[PDB]
Nucleic acid binder design. Structure first.
Lengths: 213, 214
DNA sequence: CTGCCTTCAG
């Protein structure tokens, strides 16, 4: 079966930069490769079909090239609305398959996250629950790791993370990490720690609190 | 002007079926095949199959044979996709996509998408918990245990909008949870109040939670 | 069995 191998999975650029997304095919697919853009929260839109033909409406800064197994989509000098995802898709019989996508994100200066930890509320504890919340806000680039420790022991169970998309104004990312325990479990330990590893410092940002404090 | 209007969002029980629609206008419906594509939240695109409305002929992705049934009605210029024996794995946005004048040409025009959620959960209002600290000050509120999406979170009835991060909901045993953070000057709290306002229209519920110091 | 063809046209 035909498999579309896109790269890079993510590419960081700036407005007025020229970027090239590649798409490779398991076999030769002649000229039969299409490109779609998809912006966060939206339906995809066709950019290019038959490797090089622009679809109606598509600005001429988009161009496609290639043949055989190797294809590319060039965006000559990026504009603000060009950040989003891009997928290739072959139109060489069936089954139709899409590349895994390239997410094109906007370059800024590095920012360390602002890390904040919160103990369970009295309201939650009254109901028999205990969620510990860590916010890691306005960092850049996107790649980050959060580790929880309980009394210096690493903890992976009960943790749920959520990430925002690159912000449109300030170009940062944010993340919440929530460790959910029962009241009983929570009250067996003293120290709760949210530790963030990010490019901007070799040392991780550590936020902690002690229950018995 | 090519337009594909899709039927609205579906909340459906596991084991049930759902049939969604794609009403076509602005071109000759019968002259072009109609494709269907699956996209799970935050993931890529998966081709299901197409129908040729001219002759009712179908072509499927082998994985969806038995799961998806594609039909069309010339009279109403409507394509349909029925999904059967629903599991949570079927929760996704589904698109209809206009295909080619010849079936092997590239698909061009995509519909708005139909969101399908497969769950046995019952309508449940959120529990809302204040997140107060244990120079800028960060506060939050934890919105836990609601179904279905969405909830809307504001702070001080919308008066506080900068420095807010409201995060995508995630599932905890078939109910949703989300948090929202707000960061404000230390001069403004606890001196002045900060309240998160959570609306859950599905349960006609509003929650107003004041953040107080511990 | 379920073919062939790649953009304004069976």
């Amino acid at each position: 079966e035909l498999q579309m191998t896109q790269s890079p999975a993510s590419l960081s650029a700036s407005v007025g930069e020229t970027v090239t997304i590649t798409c490779r095919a398991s076999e030769n697919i002649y000229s039969y490769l299409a490109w779609y853009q998809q912006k966060q929260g939206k339906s995809p839109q066709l950019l290019v079909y038959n490797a090089k033909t622009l679809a109606e409406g598509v600005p001429s800064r988009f161009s496609g090239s290639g043949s055989g197994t190797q294809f590319s989509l060039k965006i000559n000098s990026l504009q603000p609305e060009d950040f989003g995802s891009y997928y290739c898709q072959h139109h060489y019989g069936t089954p139709l398959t899409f590349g895994a996508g390239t997410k094109l994100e906007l370059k800024r200066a590095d920012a360390a996250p602002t890390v904040s930890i919160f103990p369970p509320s009295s309201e939650q504890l009254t109901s028999g629950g205990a969620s510990v919340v860590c916010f890691l806000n306005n960092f850049y680039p996107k790649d980050i790791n959060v580790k929880w420790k309980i009394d210096g022991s690493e903890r992976q169970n009960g943790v749920l993370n959520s990430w925002t998309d690159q912000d449109s104004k300030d170009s940062t990312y944010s993340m919440s990490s929530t460790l959910t325990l029962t009241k009983d479990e929570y009250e067996r330990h003293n120290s709760y720690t949210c530790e963030a590893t990010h490019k901007t410092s070799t040392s991780p940002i550590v936020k902690s609190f002690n229950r018995n404090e | 002007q090519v337009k594909l209007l899709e039927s609205g969002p579906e909340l459906v029980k596991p084991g049930a079926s759902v049939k969604m629609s794609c009403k076509a206008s602005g071109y000759t419906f019968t002259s072009y095949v109609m494709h269907w594509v699956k996209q799970k939240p935050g993931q890529g695109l998966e081709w299901i199959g197409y129908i040729n409305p001219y002759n009712d002929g179908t072509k499927y992705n082998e994985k969806f044979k038995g799961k998806a049934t594609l039909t069309s009605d010339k009279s109403s210029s409507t394509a349909y996709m029925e999904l059967s024996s629903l599991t949570s794995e079927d929760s996704a946005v589904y698109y209809c996509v206009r295909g080619g004048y010849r079936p092997y040409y590239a698909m061009d025009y995509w519909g708005q998408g139909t969101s399908v959620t497969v769950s046995s959960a019952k309508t449940t209002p959120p529990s809302v918990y204040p997140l107060a600290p244990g120079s800028m000050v960060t506060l939050g509120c934890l919105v836990k245990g609601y179904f279905p999406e969405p909830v809307t979170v504001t702070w001080n009835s919308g008066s506080l909008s900068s420095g807010v991060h409201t995060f995508p909901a995630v599932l905890q045993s078939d109910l949703y949870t989300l948090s929202s953070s707000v960061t404000v000057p230390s001069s403004t709290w606890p001196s002045e109040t900060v309240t998160c306002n959570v609306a859950h229209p599905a349960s006609s519920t509003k929650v107003d939670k004041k953040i107080v110091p511990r």
